[PDB]
From a paper:
Progenitor sequence of the assigned 28 sequences was generated by ancestral sequence reconstruction, and the generated sequence exhibited L-lysine oxidase activity; thus, we named the enzyme AncLLysO. AncLLysO has a fold typical of the flavin-dependent amine oxidase (FAO) superfamily —the Rossmann-core fold, which recognizes FAD, and a hot-dog-like fold, which is important for the recognition of substrates. Taken together, we assigned a novel FAD-dependent enzyme, called LLysO and bearing a main L-Lys α-oxidase and promiscuous monooxygenase activity, from the database. The main-chain amino group of L-Lys is deprotonated by an activated solvent water molecule, and the hydride on the main-chain carbon atom is transferred to FAD.
Previous research indicates that, in many FAD-dependent oxidases, the Lys residue at the site would recognize the O2 molecule, which oxidizes the FADH2, and their variants quietly reduce the activity. In AncLLysO, K387 corresponds with the residue, and the activity of the AncLLysO([name]) variant was reduced below the detection limit of the activity assay as expected. Crystal structures of the L-Lys- and L-Arg-binding forms of AncLLysO([name]) were determined at 2.4- and 2.2-Å resolution, respectively, using the cocrystallization method. In general, fitting of substrates into an electron density map would be difficult at the resolution of the AncLLysO([name]) structure; however, the substrates appeared to be fitted into the map appropriately. In fact, the polder Fo-Fc omit map indicates that L-Lys and L-Arg coordinate at the active site using different binding modalities; a stereo view of L-Lys- and L-Arg-binding forms is shown in Fig. S3. Differences in the binding mode would affect the substrate specificity of AncLLysO. In fact, the main-chain carbon atom of L-Arg is moved to the arrowed direction approximately 1.5 Å compared with L-Lys. Because of this movement, the distance between the main-chain carbon atom of L-Arg and the N5 atom of FAD is about 1.2 Å longer than in the case of L-Lys. This causes inefficient hydride transfer of Cα-H from L-Arg to the N5 atom of FAD during the reaction by AncLLysO. From a structural comparison between the ligand-free form and the L-Lys- or L-Arg-binding form of AncLLysO, substrate binding appeared to induce a conformational change of a loop that is formed by residues 251 to 254 (251-GGYY-254); cis–trans transformation at G251 is remarkable in this change.
Numbering used by the authors:
A (entry chain A), B (entry chain B): 1 to 586
Amino acid sequence: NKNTPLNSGKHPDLKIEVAIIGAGTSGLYTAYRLVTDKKFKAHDVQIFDMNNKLGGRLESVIMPGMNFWGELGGMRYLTSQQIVTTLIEGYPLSEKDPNKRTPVLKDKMTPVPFPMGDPSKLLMYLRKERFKQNAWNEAQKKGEKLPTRYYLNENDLGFSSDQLFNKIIYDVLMADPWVAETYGSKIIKGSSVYDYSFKLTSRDWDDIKPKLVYNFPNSPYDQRKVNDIGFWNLIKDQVSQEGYEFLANAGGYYSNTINWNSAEAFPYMVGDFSAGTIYKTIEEGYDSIAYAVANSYMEHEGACIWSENKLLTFTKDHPLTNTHKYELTFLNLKTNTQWKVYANSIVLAMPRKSLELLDQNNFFFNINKNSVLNNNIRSVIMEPAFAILMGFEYPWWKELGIDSGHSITDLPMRQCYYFGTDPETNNSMLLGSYGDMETETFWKALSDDKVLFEVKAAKSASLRELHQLDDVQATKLMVGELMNQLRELHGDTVTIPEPYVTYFKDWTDEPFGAGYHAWKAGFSVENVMPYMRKPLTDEQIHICGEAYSDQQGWVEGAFCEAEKMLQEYFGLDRPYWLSPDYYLGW
Amino acid sequence: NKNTPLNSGKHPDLKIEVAIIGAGTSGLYTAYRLVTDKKFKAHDVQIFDMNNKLGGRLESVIMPGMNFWGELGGMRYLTSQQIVTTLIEGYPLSEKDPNKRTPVLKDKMTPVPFPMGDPSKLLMYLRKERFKQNAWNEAQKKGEKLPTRYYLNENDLGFSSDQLFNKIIYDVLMADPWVAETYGSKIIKGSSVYDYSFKLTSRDWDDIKPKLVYNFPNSPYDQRKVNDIGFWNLIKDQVSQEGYEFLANAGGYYSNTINWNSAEAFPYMVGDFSAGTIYKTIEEGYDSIAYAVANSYMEHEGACIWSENKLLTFTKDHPLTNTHKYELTFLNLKTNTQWKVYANSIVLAMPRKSLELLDQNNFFFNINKNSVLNNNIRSVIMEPAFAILMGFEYPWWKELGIDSGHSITDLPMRQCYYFGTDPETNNSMLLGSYGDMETETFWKALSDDKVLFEVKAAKSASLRELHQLDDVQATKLMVGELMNQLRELHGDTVTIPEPYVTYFKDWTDEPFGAGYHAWKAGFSVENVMPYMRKPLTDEQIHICGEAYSDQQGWVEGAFCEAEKMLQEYFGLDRPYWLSPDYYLGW
Ligand SMILES: Cc1cc2nc3c(=O)[nH]c(=O)nc-3n(C[C@H](O)[C@H](O)[C@H](O)COP(=O)(O)OP(=O)(O)OC[C@H]3O[C@@H](n4cnc5c(N)ncnc54)[C@H](O)[C@@H]3O)c2cc1C
Ligand SMILES: Cc1cc2nc3c(=O)[nH]c(=O)nc-3n(C[C@H](O)[C@H](O)[C@H](O)COP(=O)(O)OP(=O)(O)OC[C@H]3O[C@@H](n4cnc5c(N)ncnc54)[C@H](O)[C@@H]3O)c2cc1C
Ligand SMILES: NC(=[NH2+])NCCC[C@H](N)C(=O)O
């Protein structure tokens, strides 16, 4: 299923209609929709990627001794994300029996719940105090306010990060009298001082985000749109810098407390409501969604993914202006030779860093001409991520009654996910994932070191099998220091043995430069998104993907931006399998 | 004296020997030494800068109502920095009667001691606890260990940041048996648990830094060169993450605690031993040293600083290869037109960001040829800095008995300097913050906002005078939030009135991309420095300046790298006025 053919060759002066650059989720989805709806024959729609793999930031791996998929990138989806959920599960989403679902893609994909674990057993390790994640709720059940080594404002004492986040967003929303009046029925103060909940929909958030005013009379930010305030600016203002320190650390990496757009951060933090929805993954690896869309595209005659082929530049000044608006110059990495593709539409299905790495002197990127394009490319923050998969001969975490889920710390490692145990071998997988709150610089000095971790034999994992992964091992300095932090996080009551295998991915590396993106304060997001899907009025050049999506951090963001671009400029209707009530904006 | 002529015009096909690109301290010093020692006629040595002023990261300003110089960039020097000190004060430095000193530069420069303030009155505000900076010493005088809201290891309890830093460096030095044996006499444990001191010289540090081994058998970093360990990596290892949090926040700007080269950080923290030396500035503004060096150069007929002229690219492939190795293409910013200069030597007197903004496709930078150059350009961290100068109608800080010096906080502002009061007007100047790497994103969302602070009339400061500075005002959001943090830092015992004028510079802006630079762990600094002063053996192309100096953060670093380059490639001797015992390395 994951052996989708990739062509590392070239075809000098190939003449097509639509060049898609990026074999990530948005680029694959674009090519799949175009050929499946028969807008073009598959030989006129071609995908190019510089990688030796399709999928981009989805990359599922199997490590010797562990007969289940680890994730280097994307792990999971939410069933409220209708494009990715329908593509995985079939339709309609109402149908609760998976056997009565109608598949959209042929590839077998087994949806399984994402294990979230037990707050009673999962750890929070902050300023050297070891808590269970439920510690705040247990105190509140006994009429107590849990003390921490953070000096919160007095009115926040005993709040958890979840509860305090909810109270902040509630307070900011309800202080805007227009929001209070129009949406108060969906912004809910429960009975307990700690209980705040939201029933605001995607549609509601789209009405709110551009209008919401910060109404706090002696704040520095008073009477400004929440859109124009950084989320760290806004959190400090509401709960003091000690409050920000608490939320930034206790939130974890899945929680986004960088100084990004506060209007956009609000829905990110409290969800687009329909709370029958849960986190799931794919038994065969989350990258299966990319392989399934790619294979659906590749089953049409003339379909081709050109791998190890890097776009350098593109021009309107070429010999074939009579048949083709654009000449694209690709670098065939295997031969180090340049070749030309001729096309009438270009889809840049790639993030901010990838755009910046293209020739900035051509007609499209030239900053002397297209100052608006360049400003809007710079409208999103490139948030670093690293993934380190570690294989142990046994699940040492079970000694603490931990099955699954995430432990969270202010230590530089930030967070570990206890991924699974192979019931035959007992070999067990931990994910370390980090990058936020300055931890990139801590880890970069260690991951840049030249001396690699050496693989070690375990059950069903021979040196010959493991030596195939020599190249993708973490550094010994990074493994040693992470092991040190895991011992401090879990405490002295559990012995943590050395791992036998690791897998390391740095998503800051070119061409990605980021794990995910975040809208900056002070940009009109509702206007930048349509702009990015077709920057120049007289050019059939489109940007799509997660980076300029309004579901940043998510495959659904990449799919939604591609889908909007398809319906706007490629004359496609909503897919039959996609509910018309799934909101995609203007 | 600061009206040094700048030529914003062009001279198509100008034919010279030495093109210096960067009218910063190093570029000015290069041009001054070359023409003063008559290595070249002044018409054959030309300086080019894209700015509309000389000085680079030295920029002194006067604000209406305040009849003294504020500093946007460099502020002060140490009398152990012999090039900058001799240039300012005259020679020799042994002569302690200033009337028996022989001036080196004619421009009037009045050295005045840098006011350091009173640790009894200066504030430290950490995790919401307000201390006087002397609090740790006062506790130690009463036999006590000052408690803080940081959970230090038990062996560090009651230590100040200074004392704990000294202990860390002592412990690491003395654990290397070769360092213990060879240099133990200069690495001194005093009687009190808190007392550690060093008599290691510039020369001693140059022997030590490349050899020093981290000898800690339980550490992840054991048996690695201290050179190969990030300073945050090393500090956490020695005093725990809570210890790093204490040092990073309590240190201030005086401390560099980013994850940079530990071998280089050691002397940065504990000095090149040479006590009796103090901090000074120049009454006429610290940028006076730049104007003095520039004017000495510009006294020669044919000398020219080409301002508002930006180097784009340079090539060996041009019509005049018989007389001139290199053709330089400059962009004349006033006309947006390109012009050519022909030269046999190129001096890039510019930081990392400036080099990266040049054409990366030419013979020199092209990564297909010179991957080694590119790796060495990336050997230093670009540390962000900004400057916000604020003018108040009175020195509100005097209510707390504060004359001068720095308050330090874990609030995002990090540090403020109480600068001066105009005794006629009483209008008084704060340097609000430089921000830093951690806090760049907190402040950037506010400084990028479009609504600028509105100037307000004060004594000897009319609206018409102030409206000339409309362009360089901080944003309302940045001024309001900094004022909020100043109120929290100082407490409710002082009322802080609104400022009437501000001055904002962001040193992350192109072409600087940094306030200062920091060597990365894992680079052989002793080998990169000589490499950068002449990267290619067959080319008369040189890099000098602070960025690849071993006195990063300092004018002295820029002067020393220019001086070494001059003695190595341009046939100059040490200047007559520079003591032969001033160590300048290999
Ligand atoms: C650590 C991590 C965790 C994540 N977790 C989740 C999660 O749990 N759930 C989820 O739904 N999402 C998650 N995501 C996000 C998800 O992986 C991405 O949003 C999505 O995969 C991005 O799709 P895209 O189309 O933007 O392209 P990308 O995946 O960014 O792919 C872009 C492609 O363009 C190629 N390219 C760039 N420049 C060129 C060039 N010049 N020539 C040729 N090819 C070029 C690249 O090689 C790449 O294949 C996560 C991301 C990361 C990093
Ligand atoms: C906030 C702050 C505080 C500081 N405090 C002190 C202090 O108290 N004492 C001290 O001694 N040092 C201090 N420093 C450092 C000191 O200011 C610098 O180390 C020093 O001025 C750097 O000089 P340089 O020769 O490296 O060049 P720079 O100052 O970096 O000048 C480089 C020049 O190159 C030009 N340039 C770049 N690219 C091009 C191009 N393509 N074409 C043409 N021109 C180009 C730029 O316009 C610029 O003028 C401070 C720095 C900052 C930011
Ligand atoms: N390693 C560095 N460059 N540190 C920057 C510190 C600030 C600089 N020394 C100054 O005097 O303001």
